[PDB]
Design a protein around this ligand. Structure first.
Ligand SMILES: [Cu+2]
Ligand SMILES: [Cu+2]
Ligand SMILES: [Cu+2]
Ligand SMILES: [Cu+2]
Length: 476
C-alpha cells in the first residue's frame, strides 16, 4: 500500500475576542490497523500549532475534558510562573483555566505538553503534545520557506509501544524509572512512516523530539545535508551545515533540506549511544518520513545570515548555582538489571567499553537534585530577575542521559557535558545534555515566579522527572 501523508497540525490564531480554545480529551487513534485510546488537544492525538506574535498578547482557554487532573506547560516560552503551567498549574477534570500570554522573545518553534506532578510521562505517552510557532518582525524579512504544510512543516517524532490488545503500554516501574519509557514503534505527527510531498527547492522542517526518553539523531537516507537555521529558542546567526543532527528529548531544531525532482529520500534517525535505545528496529537507521519531490518550484530562501547573536558577557562575579543530579544507586542497578535481563547485551549496543522495605526505598522518589527528590512545596532557591547567572549541572555519579531543561528562559550553553557546544547548539537553548559529566549554562529570567507558581528545572527524560529529578525555583 502507499504511505499515509504526513499529518499537519492546524495552525491556530486568535479570534476577535483574542482567544484560542484548547480542549484536552480522550478519543481513539489507529496504529497498524488496531484502535487505541489516545489523548489530544483539539482532537484525539497530539495537538494544533498555536501561532504567537512577539509583542502581542493572547488569551488561551484550556478545557480539561479528561477525568483526571492535568496542567499545560509552554515549553520554551518565557512567561511568568503564574501562567507557566508546571505541576502547580492544576486544571481540574471537567474544568477550565485561562491564561494570557504576553509574548516577548524572538521567533522560534516551541511546544506545549502536560506537567502533572508524577504523571507527566504517562500523559505525554497517552498523546498530549502541541506546537507553538512564534513569529516576529525580523524572521519574515528572511523569506524562508513559509507555506505551512507544504514547504514549512512540523515533524514531531515519538516512540510508543503497545500491548497485544492494541492499547498504549505505558508503565512507570523500576526499569523505566532508571532508563526511561521507550518503545518499538516510531510515530511522525502521530503516523507510522508517512510521506510528505514537497516542492522543488528548500523544505523547512521544524523537528521536535517528543519522546519520553529516547534521544534521536536525524540524517537523510542519501546523505544530503541538513542546514540548521534555528534551535530551541530561535534562529542561529547563520545556517550551520550538518550531516547528522542529534536531538535530545524536548529539543527543537529547524532545518532546511534540498528537494530535487525525481529523487525521493527519507528523513531517518540513526542509532544512538543511549542505554536501551538500540533494540531492533532501532539498532539500524530508522525511517522517519519519506520526502516525495513535486515538480513545482518552492519559493523559499536559505539566506547567508539569519540573525544577530549577542556575545557572551563577562562571567566574572556572576552567581554560580550548583545542581547535582543523582539517582539512587540501588534503583539504578535494579532498573539496569531488569533492562539487561529483558533484552540482553543489545540493551548496551553502541555504548562505551525483592521484598518491601518501606517508603524510604520507594523508586517514586529515587531520582534527585541536590540530594532532594522534587518537593512541590519547597522551591530550592530564589533566582534573581533580570540578572545573568551561571548554572552548573552535574550528572557525575551515574551514566544515564539527562537532557536538562530550565523553565522561564532561553539560555546560552557555556559547556555541554564537558566540551564547548557545537556551533548549531551555541545559540538559544532551553535544554543542555548532561551525561556522566558537567554542563554550565548562562541564564537570565525576565519574569517573576512566586512560590505558589514556581519555575521548574529538571531532567526531560520524563520518567526521571516523575520520580524526583526536578526542583522548583522562584524569580523576583
Ligand atoms: Cu517540556
Ligand atoms: Cu519547559
Ligand atoms: Cu535524567
Ligand atoms: Cu518542565
Amino acid at each position: 500500500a502507499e504511505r499515509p501523508t504526513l499529518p499537519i497540525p492546524d495552525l491556530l490564531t486568535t479570534d476577535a475576542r483574542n482567544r484560542i480554545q484548547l480542549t484536552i480529551g480522550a478519543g481513539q487513534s489507529t496504529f497498524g490497523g488496531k484502535t487505541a485510546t489516545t489523548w489530544g488537544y483539539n482532537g484525539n492525538l497530539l495537538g494544533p500549532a498555536v501561532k504567537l506574535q512577539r509583542g502581542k498578547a493572547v488569551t488561551v482557554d484550556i478545557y480539561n475534558q479528561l477525568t483526571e487532573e492535568t496542567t499545560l506547560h509552554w515549553h520554551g516560552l518565557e512567561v511568568p510562573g503564574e501562567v507557566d503551567g508546571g505541576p502547580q498549574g492544576i486544571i481540574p477534570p471537567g474544568g477550565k483555566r485561562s491564561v494570557t500570554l504576553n509574548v516577548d522573545q524572538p521567533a522560534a518553534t516551541c511546544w506545549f505538553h502536560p506537567h502533572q506532578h508524577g504523571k507527566t510521562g504517562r500523559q505525554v505517552a497517552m498523546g498530549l503534545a502541541g506546537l507553538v510557532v512564534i513569529e516576529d518582525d525580523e524572521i519574515l524579512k528572511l523569506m524562508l520557506p513559509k507555506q505551512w504544510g507544504i514547504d514549512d512543516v512540523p515533524v514531531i517524532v515519538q516512540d510508543k509501544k503497545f500491548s497485544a490488545d492494541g492499547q498504549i503500554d505505558y508503565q512507570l516501574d523500576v526499569m523505566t524509572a532508571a532508563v526511561g519509557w521507550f518503545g518499538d514503534t516510531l510515530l511522525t505527527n502521530g503516523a507510522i512512516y508517512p510521506q510528505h510531498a514537497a516542492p522543488r527547492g528548500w523544505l523547512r522542517l521544524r523537528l521536535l523530539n517528543g519522546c519520553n526518553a529516547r534521544s534521536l539523531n536525524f540524517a537523510t537516507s542519501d546523505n544530503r545535508p541538513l542546514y540548521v537555521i534555528a534551535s530551541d529558542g530561535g534562529l542561529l546567526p547563520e545556517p550551520v551545515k550538518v550531516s547528522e543532527l542529534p536531538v535530545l528529548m524536548g529539543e527543537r531544531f529547524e532545518v532546511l533540506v534540498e528537494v530535487n525532482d525525481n529523487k525521493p529520500f527519507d528523513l531517518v534517525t540513526l542509532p544512538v549511544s543511549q542505554m536501551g535505545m538500540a533494540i531492533a528496529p532501532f539498532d539500524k537507521p530508522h525511517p522517519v518520513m519519506r520526502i516525495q519531490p513535486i515538480a513545482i518550484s518552492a519559493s523559499g530562501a536559505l539566506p547567508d545570515t539569519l540573525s544577530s547573536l549577542p556575545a557572551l558577557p563577562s562571567l566574572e562575579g556572576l552567581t554560580v548555582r550548583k545542581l547535582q543530579l543523582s539517582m539512587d544507586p540501588m534503583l539504578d542497578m535494579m532498573g539496569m538489571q531488569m533492562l539487561m535481563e529483558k533484552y540482553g547485551d543489545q540493551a548496551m549496543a553502541g555504548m562505551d567499553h525483592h521484598m518491601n522495605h518501606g517508603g524510604k526505598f520507594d523508586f517514586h522518589h529515587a531520582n534527585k537534585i541536590n540530594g532532594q527528590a522534587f518537593d512541590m512545596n519547597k522551591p530550592m532557591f530564589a533566582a534573581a530577575k533580570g540578572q545573568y547567572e551561571r548554572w552548573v549541572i552535574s550528572g557525575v555519579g551515574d551514566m544515564m542521559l539527562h537532557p536538562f531543561h530550565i523553565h522561564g528562559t532561553q539560555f546560552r550553553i557555556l559547556s555541554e557535558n564537558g566540551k564547548p557546544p557545537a556551533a548549531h547548539r551555541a545559540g538559544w537553548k532551553d535544554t543542555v545534555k548532561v551525561e556522566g559529566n558537567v554542563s554550565e549554562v548562562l541564564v537570565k529570567f525576565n519574569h517573576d515566579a512566586p512560590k505558589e507558581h514556581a519555575y521548574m528545572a529538571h531532567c526531560h527524560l520524563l520518567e526521571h522527572e516523575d520520580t524526583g529529578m526536578m526542583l522548583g525555583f522562584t524569580v523576583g
